[PDB]
Design a binder for these strands. Structure first.
Ligand SMILES: [Mg+2]
Ligand SMILES: [Mg+2]
Ligand SMILES: [Mg+2]
Ligand SMILES: [Mg+2]
Ligand SMILES: [Mg+2]
Ligand SMILES: [Mg+2]
Ligand SMILES: [Mg+2]
Ligand SMILES: [Mg+2]
Ligand SMILES: [Mg+2]
Ligand SMILES: [Mg+2]
Ligand SMILES: [Mg+2]
Ligand SMILES: [Mg+2]
Lengths: 104, 154, 54, 112
RNA sequence: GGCGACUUUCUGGUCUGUAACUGACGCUGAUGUGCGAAAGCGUGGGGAUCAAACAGGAUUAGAUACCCUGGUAGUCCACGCCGUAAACGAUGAGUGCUAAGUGUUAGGGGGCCCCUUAGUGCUGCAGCUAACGCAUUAAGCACUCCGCCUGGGGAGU
RNA sequence: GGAGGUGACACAUGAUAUA
RNA sequence: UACAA
């Protein structure tokens, strides 16, 4: 859980956390103490609308089959980073993680 | 049409000669839905054929139709400033259409007084490789072989 | 090594079936080698050691 | 009576010309699309080329020619048609298109 | 600006490494002086191809065009002149500093890879921008010098 | 997938403001 | 629409 992505794509901000690059296992352990489907656009920023679908899911079969299945993560961070913890590989941006775990 | 080909309608064989081609001929003869007149003309014409030739009317009629049906036709085409008459091969179902259409159309232009007389003489003529309908087929091949260089268009 | 225009056997390997110089992306030669190759082949063509167009 | 020969094909975008000779270069019989009464766009069709090599070959074989070589030229579409028909006239088949090594200036492009 | 077959002769510049040497001898640059595609001009040669003008043939209501058949200057050489182009990266020169990734050209060092110079491309942060975009080859951050701009037309008259 | 290089018959016209 | 022709 400490072998990151290839060198030809490693973000420069993971140099402290980092052939291929190997993660900082020693630093992740100290960081770990400090700390499945598509993410709908506006899951957090549009709860005034999603909750209606969440409520309508609780309350047709064609909708529910996709609704149950529903209710890489750049959409989610913006929904949270704009509101003012997560595994952060070398290719991922660390500057936008409050509790970054530098483990693969 | 743009979507695709449309299914065609079958016809019944005629009660006298057990022939679907004869039924299709009656429909070409028929005007304004008057089928009884068309049937009367066709069966009277076939009696004239059978006795002016000595043979079966149907047998003469298949010979006559084979001499009218074309094998090659010409199609209009626009090719960048020059209309080209592209020669194409007539499909088997269109061959029968043109054979029957030309036979009736050129029987209508003849000088005999009754249509049964005109149709019977067209059939007898076309069975001897003559007449207006056979000439029209000849002029269609004469237009096609004059353009067989243009067969490379589509 | 420096390519000699007299060494026709080495040069023939880099010409095609019509006597054309083969591109280096085909033969895998490097850029500086291909430049030396081209001068030697043109020298050898002039001395009739290699054909212009066969 | 000559048996060994060479067949020259000159296919352009306006006309196809075929000349048959020995290896000594002295011609024996020639035809073209124009020699068959074809005019204009008819003179360039691949079909119209084959009617010309067939005519040319029949005249060369009349002299008694059996084996002929092929030299093809020009970008005219009547190339396969005029070459396959060479083997289709009882003749035994055993590119000379001029390319310059950057010589003379070509004419201006047509602004049609 | 430009430079493309090969050979010889004459000759300019750049790059890398080294750290012998000199010891700030540098940068920029008004005026000035030179070089400067193509067309063009003068004198004299040359003249294959192509081709302004021009002629004929087409097309068209007309066709002083586009297309076709020809064709002169010119296109080529030498020596003078001309000094202009969307002469463009539409981006003046010099110097330093500021994430990365990835091709390529010419080198160097070390163990095909790693490091490093100098060019030449693409992508892309920070920053900048009206936006497009630029982004260690800046259009970022700074200092020096030069050139230039101040609504459009009239008029580069 | 997106860029940069490379190459590739005939058809005339429609006043001013207000829109 | 008010015009122009
Ligand atoms: Mg150098
Ligand atoms: Mg200076
Ligand atoms: Mg000055
Ligand atoms: Mg000049
Ligand atoms: Mg001309
Ligand atoms: Mg001159
Ligand atoms: Mg000069
Ligand atoms: Mg300017
Ligand atoms: Mg600067
Ligand atoms: Mg700078
Ligand atoms: Mg960029
Ligand atoms: Mg670089």
């Amino acid at each position: 859980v400490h072998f990151g992505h290839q060198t030809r794509r490693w973000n420069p901000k993971m140099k402290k956390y980092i052939g291929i690059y190997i993660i900082d296992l020693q630093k992740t352990v100290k960081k770990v103490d400090e700390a499945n489907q598509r993410w709908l656009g506006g899951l957090l920023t549009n709860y005034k609308t999603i909750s209606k679908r969440i409520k309508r899911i609780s309350e047709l079969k064609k909708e529910y089959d996709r609704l149950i299945k529903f209710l890489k993560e750049r959409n989610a961070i913006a929904e949270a980073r704009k509101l003012n913890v997560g595994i952060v590989d070398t290719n991922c941006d660390p500057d936008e993680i409050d509790y970054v775990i530098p483990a693969n | 049409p743009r979507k695709g080909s449309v299914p065609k309608r079958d016809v019944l064989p005629d009660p006298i000669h057990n022939s679907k081609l004869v039924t299709k001929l009656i429909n070409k003869i028929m005007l304004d839905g008057k089928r009884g007149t068309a049937q009367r003309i066709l069966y009277s014409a076939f009696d004239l054929v059978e006795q002016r030739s000595g043979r079966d009317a149907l047998e003469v009629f298949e010979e006559a139709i084979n001499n009218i049906m074309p094998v090659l036709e010409v199609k209009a085409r626009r090719v960048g400033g020059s209309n080209y008459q592209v020669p194409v091969e007539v499909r088997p179902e269109r061959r029968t259409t043109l054979g029957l259409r030309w036979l009736v159309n050129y029987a209508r232009l003849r000088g005999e007084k009754t249509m049964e007389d005109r149709l019977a003489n067209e059939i007898l003529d076309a069975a001897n490789n003559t007449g207006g309908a056979v000439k029209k087929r000849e002029d269609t091949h004469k237009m096609a072989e004059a353009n067989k260089a243009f067969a490379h268009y589509r | 090594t420096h390519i000699d225009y007299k060494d026709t056997e080495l040069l023939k390997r880099f010409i095609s079936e019509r006597g054309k110089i083969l591109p280096r992306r085909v033969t895998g030669t490097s850029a500086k080698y291909q430049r030396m190759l081209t001068t030697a082949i043109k020298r050898s063509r002039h001395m009739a050691l290699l054909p212009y167009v066969k | 009576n000559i048996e060994n020969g060479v067949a020259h094909i000159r296919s352009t975008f306006n006309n196809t010309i075929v000349t048959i000779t020995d290896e000594f270069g002295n011609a024996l019989s020639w035809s073209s699309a124009g020699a068959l009464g074809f005019k204009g766009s008819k003179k360039s069709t691949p079909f119209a080329a084959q009617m010309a090599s067939e005519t040319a070959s029949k005249s060369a074989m009349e002299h008694g020619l059996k084996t002929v070589e092929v030299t093809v030229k020009g970008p005219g579409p009547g190339r396969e048609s005029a070459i396959r028909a060479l083997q289709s006239a009882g003749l035994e088949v055993t590119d000379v298109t001029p390319v310059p090594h950057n010589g003379c200036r070509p004419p201006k492009r047509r602004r049609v």
